[PDB]
Write a protein that binds this ligand. Sequence first.
Ligand code: AGS
Ligand code: MG
Lengths: 187, 187, 419, 209
Amino acid sequence: TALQQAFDTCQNNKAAWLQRKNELAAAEQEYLRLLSGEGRNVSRLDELRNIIEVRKWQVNQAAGRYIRSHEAVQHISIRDRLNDFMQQHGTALAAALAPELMGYSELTAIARNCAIQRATDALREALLSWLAKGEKINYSAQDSDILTTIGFRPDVASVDDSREKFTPAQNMIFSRKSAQLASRQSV
Amino acid sequence: TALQQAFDTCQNNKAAWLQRKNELAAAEQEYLRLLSGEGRNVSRLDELRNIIEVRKWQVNQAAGRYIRSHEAVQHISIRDRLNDFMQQHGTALAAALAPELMGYSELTAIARNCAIQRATDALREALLSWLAKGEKINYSAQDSDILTTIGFRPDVASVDDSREKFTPAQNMIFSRKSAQLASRQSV
Amino acid sequence: MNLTELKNTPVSELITLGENMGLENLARMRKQDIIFAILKQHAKSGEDIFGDGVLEILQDGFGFLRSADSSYLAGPDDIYVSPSQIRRFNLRTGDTISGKIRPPKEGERYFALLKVNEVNFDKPENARNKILFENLTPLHANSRLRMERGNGSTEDLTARVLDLASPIGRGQRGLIVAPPKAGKTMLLQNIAQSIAYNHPDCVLMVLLIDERPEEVTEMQRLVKGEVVASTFDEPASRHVQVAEMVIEKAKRLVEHKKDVIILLDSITRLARAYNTVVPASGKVLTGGVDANALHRPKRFFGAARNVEEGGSLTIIATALIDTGSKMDEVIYEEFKGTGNMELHLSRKIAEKRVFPAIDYNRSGTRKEELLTTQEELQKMWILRKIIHPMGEIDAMEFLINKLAMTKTNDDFFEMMKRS
Amino acid sequence: ERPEEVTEMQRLVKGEVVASTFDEPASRHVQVAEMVIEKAKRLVEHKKDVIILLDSITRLARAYNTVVPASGKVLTGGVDANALHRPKRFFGAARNVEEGGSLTIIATALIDTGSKMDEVIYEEFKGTGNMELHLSRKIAEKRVFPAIDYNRSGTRKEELLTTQEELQKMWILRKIIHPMGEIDAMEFLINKLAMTKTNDDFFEMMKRS
Ligand SMILES: Nc1ncnc2c1ncn2[C@@H]1O[C@H](COP(=O)(O)OP(=O)(O)OP(O)(O)=S)[C@@H](O)[C@H]1O
Ligand SMILES: [Mg+2]
């Protein structure tokens, strides 16, 4: 159930990022309402800038962690599929690709590396030649709808937020800004 | 069954201290023989004095650990004999000391230790009244041999060599010196 | 069979292997070329060969690799690493690798690295997509580091004295300044052994530069963790290069969610070494030190940091005082105020054979409230309000002869509290 | 050194003495220096104690500086950058062997010579040796020989080399002689040592009073 709990955590932090984006949208809508109106006081404007800055940083890091979570769940699903598929049908692959397997099994490290490289480029030419037809392929039977919902390509609003980086000193600036922000909604 | 381990630990500590004193006395007699002779090599005398210091520190440490082991043996022996006696005559002790345990059974910690100190000093007058008779008592049934072979008090040779006190800096430097002494002895 | 185990063995094991294996004359040359020859004939014999060590990148794109117990020296024991290996495993300087070495071609001497079986103690595939330095960020020290063990010993007494004098936390920026013969060697000794014993989880690094080789070798056999020490036999270039590779590999280690504490001896020595190695900028200050020679030590000293998401980097460093060289004072008050906390020692205290020679009144710390709790907070405010009025050395003997009778520090707190 | 000094040293020594006067260029001196230290290392290789005298580090540093090719970098005073490497390597060879034997160097230094080379090779050699002994001229003018500076001199790790009681014996002697001036401590110590025959006699002199 490791895959299921990993996907559950991915959904959890994705929903957290969604709520953070809702709070964002609220912050910018009240910002535009105040600036379009009679915004005489600017101290409120300054604190609004504080929340907007910490908010964009927080949504950036939340989108980034969502991207890493999605990549991790995809990788663990791929590894599980590799494991059970090899346990099912490893003997046919062994018969078809025996020489480099003996090279990797009962030889020294450098022969193992040579076997790794030749099996690598053989399988890569296999994949690039057999995908020319490119017939549509479905997901795994046990994990079809989960991966269709999460999708191989995540939301477009994730990559644009994840690419925004900041200086590590500026990262502590954002961290202390978020600390005093949390103290702000504390009161 | 820890009495046997305490016993043979005390025995081997005593043997180690005895042999430490043996090589000590050997070192001083050899150094005195060198001093009596016309040996002009002052380096030999200096290193012999260093060896004398290392040996006396080692003997002091051995005597200290032997004293600690003897105290541990005495404590465990008296605790076991006391426990079996108090199991034998617990009802009579409770009858003769009823009010204190009446209080101890349900009262809080401060009252518990107040009853504890009342019981302890009352039994101090009881014991001092009893010992006015001053009768002679032998050792226990199966712990008599351990106490006899270990001895009543530690050997006087263990207290006329431990009366010197070394601050832990001296102990550390002497441990280092004994370390290179052991290195040379190995060579 | 790796190079590490036969390197760690003494010369006698190498000799005996030599007669057992055909090398009759191994008692003429240096250790490095002797192991080079024995590894050559090993590769001739076809015995399995393994490699372990840290890789760095020189001016060219090609990279070298060096061992740990070799005192971090580059020579015949280096290992080839191609730029392609750097690219495909996003490798960089300061990363440790445990990978099988390869029998060199004719015309090349070092054992080439076939590929990485692990990167920085972790698997290469997780290192390919791994946390970078930009996310690693400097936080204030929060977790107090314990240096008290309890044995009624003078080193324990010194540890307790420095605990009560100033708190030491994880990822802090601490400095020590002391006159000559003021007790630096044994203080660093007990702090190292105490952080090793109390905290086996955190890795122990002790840095020594231009030190006497004897102090180097008696630090080699004392500290449990690995210790780097380049004595004054090597030139200033070796000292400086060791400095950056060790600080940057410590940075790489703390990048792996790992607590690292490095002991530095001494910041003045590396400052002079940097002044020697850096080209003159044409703007020289008092003492023959130019402006660009101060930024690099400043960056080195400011590298001390704690990490919010996990890990800490504690640089604890020693500095020289009043040695008769004016540039020493120049860098002393050029580095002043740049650390999280400082430890001052004096001459007259150590003259009276009072150890340790720490100055309780002068030594201090910033932001003790966050690192400690309120009970202990007021429990050392009572300490310095009691100790500040009367004399410094008088308080020294008072604390040494009153703390000695108490086995721990808390019990000491209650025993003096009733007074 | 001057030929008279060489000939009085070679006449007043027991072991063999190596000596090159000034009448030959610096190449002679430098090559003698490295091959003598190398043969001393070769002899201590056999677990044989080696003790070598040296006078003075200033002259050998000057010889190495004037014999080494220029590295393109000039330090303070006028000494070359890698020139200081060789004297430092020669001086750093002193060590006590764990397996057996030892290599001890007793090398003197020249200071306040009216020049700049001595000081500029001096500052870096303050913390190199593990034992230092200072001299001064104010004591020497009025006949207090030796005109050493005991307060400014000493030996590190003095606890391991000697026994324990004489450790605090030296400590109490030092704390007795700290208040009054160093020169005053000097004639004090020479008169206290005048009537003594053996060191322990002096110890009991100074400790029973
Ligand atoms: N806790 C201690 N335990 C044992 N000896 C100590 C302790 N503290 C100080 N000492 C002694 O104090 C003296 C100072 O030794 P050093 O470490 O050489 O001083 P230093 O401050 O390191 O400067 P150097 O190295 O002598 S120039 C030595 O004789 C030590 O034995
Ligand atoms: Mg020291």
